[PDB]
Design a protein around this ligand. Sequence first.
Ligand SMILES: [Mg+2]
Lengths: 1181, 117, 117
Amino acid sequence: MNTNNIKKYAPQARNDFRDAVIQKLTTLGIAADKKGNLQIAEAETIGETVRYGQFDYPLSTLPRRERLVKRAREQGFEVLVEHCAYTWFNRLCAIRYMELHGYLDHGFRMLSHPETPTAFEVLDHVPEVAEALLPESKAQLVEMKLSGNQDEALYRELLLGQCHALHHAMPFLFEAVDDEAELLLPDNLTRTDSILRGLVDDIPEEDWEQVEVIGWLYQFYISEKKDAVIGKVVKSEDIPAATQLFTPNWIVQYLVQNSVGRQWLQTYPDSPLKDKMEYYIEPAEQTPEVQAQLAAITPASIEPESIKVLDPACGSGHILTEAYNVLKAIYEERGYRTRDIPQLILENNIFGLDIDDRAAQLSGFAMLMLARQDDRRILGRGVRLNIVSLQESKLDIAEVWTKLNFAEYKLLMRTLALFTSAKTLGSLIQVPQEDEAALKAFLERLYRLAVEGDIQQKEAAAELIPYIQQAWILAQRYDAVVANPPYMGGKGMNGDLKEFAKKQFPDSKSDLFAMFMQHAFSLLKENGFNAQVNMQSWMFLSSYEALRGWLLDNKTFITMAHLGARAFGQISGEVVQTTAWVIKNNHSGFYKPVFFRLVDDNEEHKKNNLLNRMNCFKNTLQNDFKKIPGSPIAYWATLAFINSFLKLPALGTRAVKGLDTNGSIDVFLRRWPEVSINSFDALGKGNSKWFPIAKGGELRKWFGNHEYIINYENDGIELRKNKANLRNKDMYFQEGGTWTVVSTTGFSMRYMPKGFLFDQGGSAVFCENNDELSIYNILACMNSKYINYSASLICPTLNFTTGDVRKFPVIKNNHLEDLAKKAIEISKADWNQFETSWEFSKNKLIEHKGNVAYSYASYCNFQDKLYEQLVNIEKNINNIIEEILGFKIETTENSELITLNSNKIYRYGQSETNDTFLNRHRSDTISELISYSVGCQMGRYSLDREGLVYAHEGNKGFAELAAEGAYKTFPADNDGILPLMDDEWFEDDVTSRVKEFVRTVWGEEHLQENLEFIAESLCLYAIKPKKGESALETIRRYLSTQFWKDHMKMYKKRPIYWLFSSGKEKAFECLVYLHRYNDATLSRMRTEYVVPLLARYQANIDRLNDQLDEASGGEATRLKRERDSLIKKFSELRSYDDRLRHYADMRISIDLDDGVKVNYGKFGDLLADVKAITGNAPEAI
Amino acid sequence: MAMSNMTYNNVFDHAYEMLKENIRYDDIRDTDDLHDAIHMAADNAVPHYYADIFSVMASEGIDLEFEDSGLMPDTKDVIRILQARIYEQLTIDLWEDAEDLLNEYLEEVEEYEEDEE
Amino acid sequence: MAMSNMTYNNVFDHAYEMLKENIRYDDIRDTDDLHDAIHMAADNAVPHYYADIFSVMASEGIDLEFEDSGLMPDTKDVIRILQARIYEQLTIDLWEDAEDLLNEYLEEVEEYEEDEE
Ligand SMILES: [Mg+2]
């Protein structure tokens, strides 16, 4: 509400301000078009009356208006419009705050009339306000009081008089001399219909009682522009606009107490401020050498006037207020006059800088308000202020130093040249110290020329002061820096900024916050304190390894607090992880850093933990982090782990990156089921056209993930034309190990046999020619808990690459080889029990005998035995070595998971765990059996031999196989087309052959029991149970309803058996084998399958006509319904026959090399789910 | 609120009772007049609460596939299709066993005719 | 089984994870090439158990009226229509937030050039 009011009022207020400014400019004669070209109106005056639109401005205002045009020559129209709008908004906010605080000379509110809305309190108190502000015009104002009118700029005249009165001690916002905005006063702005009444009414009274409203106006009022500019990358326009945010006060206090308060306490132990601190952290133990060095370098005592504080990003100014409060407390401890303390603090105790003029003005206003509320001699004398910075430098010469009444000339020219392109470079511009003191004397000369001399001397001094002041401020060599660098994202990467970073230090040129940290270190004197906060993503990246090494080589840590995530109440901030740290400039090799881990804690809980000071790990050195490569400074890691990390050798150049392709993977990579086996390399040697490839997928250990095929004809000449990378064309076709570069969940390594290729996604490791180490030992080590934890710790981002794997330690043993061999054998045995692997041999339910339930129980027992054996082997291999040293508990449940299809948790999701897995799984098994049955009917599999039987192209050579005797126990179809209906009219009905298959496999003694078991098993999960029906009807319903979906899901939208369907009513459905499709298939389907069906429908239609007529009665509703059923089917089948004839007249020839994805769309609206496979809607001729 | 437990058996029992009420009130005497008597009996049986409709389809006793292609509404709302499926199933079930009530009412009215006096 | 408590939020989370995995695996570096990725992510996310579908349709987050008339299947089954509705809802919701992942992946992969070494 209170905070949301400013947010909801900022956009319309800003729009109204901009519209008023542009309207007043156009009425004056300054107009801007879409292109931005100036449209200055002609300055043709008839004489003593300017011919403007509707206003008659005085001639004296004509030159000043020209200055605005001059501004148009030097700055954009939008820039000046925004500046004027901000100036007016700031002035109105300041006067409203002053009148609400009731600290005026006359104590009367100006804009708001108490107990009288939309009026002014000064209207009744005209003489008192007049004599308080402008006595010389009091009587004339009294005359206006006699008129009871003139609500025009006369009120604005009184406001300007009040501003001139306040200019005596507040010169940075209100100016006694005539300003440029006085010419551009909005028309009828004093009227009750203007925006002033809206400002008065919208802003309540309660929200003025807060002290952070300055930050609210700083941030919320500009949030609309930040949202507008977040869409596109900014280059040099919105550098300060997009870097505005509020900083919580408690972290500011914590940093301040550990930066200056800690230094103040360490300067002399006799400081009684020990009980005055709450966030101070006392070091516990240090080596005597560093203690002696600190005692030697620490002075006995220093004066309280030597404190130097720098705030490169003051922002709202809360840090300035906190520093002022701390300094006031210190001076009160020392003992000084309560009135001169603010003066001396503002003189030589508090300093700050920024990039935005608005932030500087707001900070100055807040500081002056605090001084007024604290000091009583202020606002009557005046004092210089240091808030603004990085102002533009004018190139006018021969006039600024002409009135100077003249070594310093060269320095002045140099500092004038430096401040030209200052907005882009921010606060990173530095000035050598040697030219500081004399420059300061130059400033004093300006103070000697500020009031001495005529108006020209004063103007020259005012023009020359700000740059000298900024240079002196930035060249103070402060001893304490407390600031939070802004956050730079994708928009922060600029070409000119990158060039400047390259010109500057390139070690940490990736991000701006690192450069800010480096500059703050540079601008800090010896034995200084630097307390800062930043994001977490600076200690776990390869780029910052050199930065971390430099930091640990030249400086030392003092106190680091891991704020972590869950900050600011978890509002926005997709990356809210952050850390705070305090660094001493002195180098301490054997220091004892102290770390506090407040991660994953809410703000209230984090504050409670900080107050209680728990979870402290002061049990690490500073050089110990150098042991682990990359210096990943961590506090939870024990010293034993660090010591043992370097005691073992790591993998050398045995890791090799995979090959790369530049695109068009759709024409190279295809799945193995959809190509001929003659061209396959793994099966049927003789032609090298297709080769296995490795890419890496989900989590899987020791074996698996064999499902992709690449084209490598003639060592590669087709893809050599592109020549993407062809990386390492020497280590191919060799056994070794493979692992996934992608994140997934964890880290795992799998065996890789001969005749394989590896891609970028899956990187490969090969043993040397005669290396002592063995591949099986490496596989055993890489799947261990220790290596998993090390990999997780080194790269939390989960981006395992070649450079991050060449440092993992490896051990040497002998039992690990046989353990790895047994694990690989078990994994391969588990992987080779499904149809999706090219080593499938036989189903697991037909190799037993007896009853179907007995076979299912045997299968379940076999799976359980495999699972138990692998669990025991994993436990043994974990307990065999375990480094025979210290170890930690299971980091995650993922690191202690067994990856097998037998393990139901890994198969049916690790989250859900219910008893329904005892049913669903069962159903699945039965489904697979049915699929195998079809494989026997189509000729792909046989009950005599093992493995694939026929998978060639064009249905050529099948006659030879049939005559030889491959299919003798269970004969296969000859046409290659399997009909699928709801009647036994055809001899190729799938249900009948399924029954025959079951009877052949399990005899003819308990066929009914087996059929009942199958039907009951299917209805558990696959389909919905019905009221009453036989087993055969359930089988037929499953085949006609829930078989196409399961097959299409198993092969992942690359079907092998294509489905031809008639349409809405299932009048005609057929399955066609892809590998047995010649150019004379459609004609046979039309000839011997469709026409007899039409004849049967016609012969059955008329017979039921007489049946309904005879004995018509209560059954007439039950009857004749089939008569309605057969009417639609006949017409649908006739239309399908017409389409089939049209397509069969054209002899279509297909090629398996193209792939299912393209070949599936060459038959129009004859197949099923054309869009779900090809991706585009089918085209109808 | 969003949780309910209504089965198809409750709907069938309600439809049966309403059919008996209709055949008693309207004095149905011929088989061909039963159609409308059944139709109205179905109309005040399909629930309008979406939770009840979704719970009914997951119960036991109702299939998940239409039998007549002429009873599918031409709309874009999924509630209408489910309601039409329930209506068709109820119509089939009620017409399956409906002559019993008709002949019972006929024999009762014949008994209490009292020689048309 | 019948007492299944599956909500639209779980389906959306699974689809989001699958989309992230697919975009990481395929390494797509353009805005207009995300159609295939989102199609693949949405296809392999809808459930197949009828009880799960009926529990999802009664959850919070998914409406009951189609927005496009071209996505209506032409069949006599009711599971297909519900699955198509869920697929369309998931597609819209995921396409609502899709540029963030692409730009994040691009800016992350930009920092691994190694100066072509
Ligand atoms: Mg055949």
